[PDB]
Amino acid sequence: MYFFSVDPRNGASCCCESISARPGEVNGVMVSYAAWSAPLRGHGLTNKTTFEIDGVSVTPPKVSNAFGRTKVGVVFEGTLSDLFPNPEGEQVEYEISELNGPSNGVVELGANGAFTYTPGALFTGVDRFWFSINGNIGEYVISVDPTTSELPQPPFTTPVYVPAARRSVDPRTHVLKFVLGVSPAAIPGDVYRLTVRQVAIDCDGNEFVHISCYDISIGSCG
Amino acid sequence: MYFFSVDPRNGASSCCCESISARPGEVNGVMVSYAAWSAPLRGHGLTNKTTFEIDGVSVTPPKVSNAFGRTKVGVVFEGTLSDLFPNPEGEQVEYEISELNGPSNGVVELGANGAFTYTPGALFTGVDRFWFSINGNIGEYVISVDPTTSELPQPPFTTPVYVPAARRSVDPRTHVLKFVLGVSPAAIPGDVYRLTVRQVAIDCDGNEFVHISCYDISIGSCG
Amino acid sequence: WKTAFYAVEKRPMFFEQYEGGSSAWCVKYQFGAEDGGFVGCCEHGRILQI
Amino acid sequence: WKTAFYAVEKRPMFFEQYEGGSSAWCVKYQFGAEDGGFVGCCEHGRILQI
Amino acid sequence: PLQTIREHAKCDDNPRVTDDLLKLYREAAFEAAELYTGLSFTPEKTIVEPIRLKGRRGKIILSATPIAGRPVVFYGGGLGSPLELIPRPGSNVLFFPYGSPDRFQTWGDCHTCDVESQLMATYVTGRRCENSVPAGIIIGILKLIAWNINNPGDEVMSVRNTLNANAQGLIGGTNNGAVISGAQDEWFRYRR
Incomplete structure (x- = not known):
């Protein structure tokens, strides 16, 4: 869990803070807006x-990533070779990372880019599962539909993301909390x-804006 | 019984992965204390x-190489041990059946020349399995005894280092993970x-906080 | 209403101290009650809507 | 038998509602007893075998 | 600076233990000073701090003496609406007004047992574009540096504290450093 005390803007290497990933x-990340919000006596913070x-x-x-579709109970099969355009000519050792396999099914990885x-x-x-071709990690998403029509198409989660609604702000102590998830396809060294x-x-219903920045560095093994 | 206090992911305090000697x-058994990481994340503790x-x-x-056989209940089973040691150079074969890693629910007698x-x-x-030792090199010979009815399935030829199927545990009151680590008798010393x-x-609402760590197990003989 | 819907009653509310769980800081009470209801012949009874 | 083997009784069976772990909706009972025995004099009995 | 350390300790054209040992002595003097004093390098003048109620009328001791008159803001601790208070210049002891503006309590709860959110306070201990002065306590650091240059550790040096004796025929003792050199009685000026 990270924790940042923000500057209260009182006139008193980089500017943005450091976060390893x-x-x-x-x-999870916590920010203590107490230093900046307490002097502005009002109704505290707002969500x-x-x-x-x-x-x-x-x-x-x-x-590249990819997406598929199938009905419930029906087995789904596909390819895993047309997603890795290789510049040079070499062999391909496909692999399904066990730590990031499917969550509601099983996958039978054949010998040659088939599953x-x-x-x-x-x-x-x-359902999602993160393959790994020659060390390059990409996700494959499969949607099982309840045989009636269809389900929408998920947004292909980014390398670094903040979830939709898991944030909370305590107006009694001026602290903001949120979640910071890093995809398993993140590349070490990126920022x-x-x-x-x-x-x-x-107290009357007007606004006080406040802006900050943070620098996430995708580092391996800590 | 090893014990590691994992990093708390707070931006503060040779190889990165910790070491484990076997x-x-x-x-x-090994214990891992996620207290420093999951206690500030006030929730329902850890999950299995x-x-x-x-x-x-x-x-x-x-x-x-290893070898797998088949036999029924009560019927004696015979097998050789000479076609399991591919030797690039010429040398004698000092067949041996270690008394420590012998069979569990049976009995074997070693022949004079690759027989048992x-x-x-x-x-x-x-x-039932038992571990032979061909000229210092160690392998395993796995045999399944069938109750004479139809047949039995195939065992998975246990790996050099393994974690048992279901012996893990977790105590959400103290944020501790407990699991077992077993090493095969055929692991070669010096590897990692x-x-x-x-x-x-x-x-509190059922979402997830993931955490990944690593450990270097170096299989060393004599402690 | 005297024949279109019935409300059953078994036991009124109770409040019982919970010895155990009270860890010498946080004295914890417990309350509960039992009741219920069900619709009888729902032909006596009509609903108006826009 | 009155002198070849003695029976020791210290605190026999007791039942009690185990206050703590028992809530306003589920009871947990606890029973127990304490007894023991030993031999008195190897030189007073005998056993027949085949 | 290293050249300033040299020209103070007279090590100038007269080479003493090398620049490596000089910077090591400096790194150790920076862990002796502001560790005997308690101050913290570049501490971000605005300070948030959980302040603890003490007394029936409630003195509040500010751990960083917010300048002179900038209103320190208090919140939490049963206090539903935050409030300002302009402090003492030179001293940091104030009094929480016993007249409470509100008490936003939460009687009855089993997730937190409704104890309290503690009273916290935000202030600044800043200043002008000349925000702070770490000088004045640099002279004791330099004196400690010079003392450790010319006392490598084999010459017997010991000043005496108590007048009669210690217990036995031993040669007294105060042989510490930063005091037989004049650093403690120069850092005491910034010590509460």
Whole structure:
């Protein structure tokens, strides 16, 4: 769990703070807005925080991701070779990372870029599994539909993300909490930037904006 | 009984992965204390959704090969031991059946030249293994005794280093993970394997906090 | 209403100290009650809507 | 037998509602007893075998 | 700076233990000073701190003496609405007004047992563009440096504290450093 005490803007190496990250983890972050919100005596903070992620070093992914579809109870099979355009000519050692396998089914990885995904009995939803071709990690998503029409198409989760709704702000002690998850397809050495815009409120119903930045560094093994 | 206090992921305090020393044959226990990481994450403690993986960064592939047989209940089983030691150079074969790693529910007698006989115990059905030692090199010979009805399935030829199927545990009151680590008697001294652990906590509403760490298991003889 | 819906009653509310769980800091009470209801012949009874 | 083997009784069976771990909806009972025995004089008995 | 340390300790054209040992002595003097004093390098002048109620009328001792008159803000600790208080210049002891503005209690709860969120306070101990001065306590550091240059550790040096004796025929003792050199009685000026 990370913890940052923000500057209260009283006129008193980089500017943005440092956050280390490991491919696969999902950690939590706390920010103590007490220094900036307490002098502004009002109704404390409000749940109107906004985040934004940018990448200042990307190293674009070698292997592309992919998506499939199948009905419930029906086994789904597909390929895993047309997703890795290789520039040179070499061999391909496909692998399904056991730590990031499926969650509601099983996958039978054949010898040559082939697999079959049998979903669990009576399961309708989305499922993901992170393959690894020549060390390059990419996710494959499969949606099992309840045989009626279809399910929507998931958004292909980013290398670094903040979940939809897991944030909370305590107006009694001026602390913001949120979750910071790093995809297992993150590439070591890359650096992202998370900008946070937090809004306070006065006694009458006007706003006090406050903006900060953070530098996430994707490092291996800690 | 090893004990590791994992890093707390707070941006504060040679190889990164910790070390674990094991001797071929032993079966030990390990404790991991996620307190420093999961206690500030006020939730429902840990969950039994952990996953382990064993990868080898140095193998030195074995010299002798293993072998699998089949037999029924009460019927004596015979087998040889000479076609399991591919020798590139010419040398004598000092066949040996270690008294420590012998069969569990039967009995074998070693022949003079690559011969042995596994007479299973009366009224016994299942799977029984025993570890031979061809000229210092160690392998295993696995035999399954069938209850004469149809057939038995195939055992998975236990690996040099393994984590047992279901012996893990967790105490959410103190945030401690307990699991077993067993090394096969055929592990070659001097090698090193890598064990990875994925422990997932839980918040108050049922979401997940993932955490990954690694451990270097170096199979060393004589302690 | 006297024939379209019935409300059953078994025991009124109770409040019982919970010795155990009270860890010498946090004295913990416990309360509960039992009741129920069910719809009888739902032909006597109509609903108006926009 | 009145002198070849003695029976020791210290605190025999007792039942009690184990207050603590028992809530306003589930009871947990606990029973127990304490007894023992030893031999008195190897030179007073005998055993017949085949 | 290293050249300033040299010109103070007279090690100038007269080479003493090398620059490696000089920077090591400096690294140790920076763990002796502001560790005997208690101050912290670059501590981000604005300070948040859980302040503890003490007394029936409640003195509040500010651990960083917020400058002179900038209103320190208090919140939490049964206090539903935060409030300002302008402090003492030179001293940091104030009084929490016993007249309470509100008490936002939460009687009855089993997830936190409704004890309390502690009283906390935010202030600044900053200043002007001349925000702070770590000088004044540099002279004791330099004196400690010079003392450790010219006392490598084989010459017997010991000043005496008590007048009569210690117990036995032993040669007294105060042989510590930073006091037989004049650093303690120069750092005591910034010590509470």
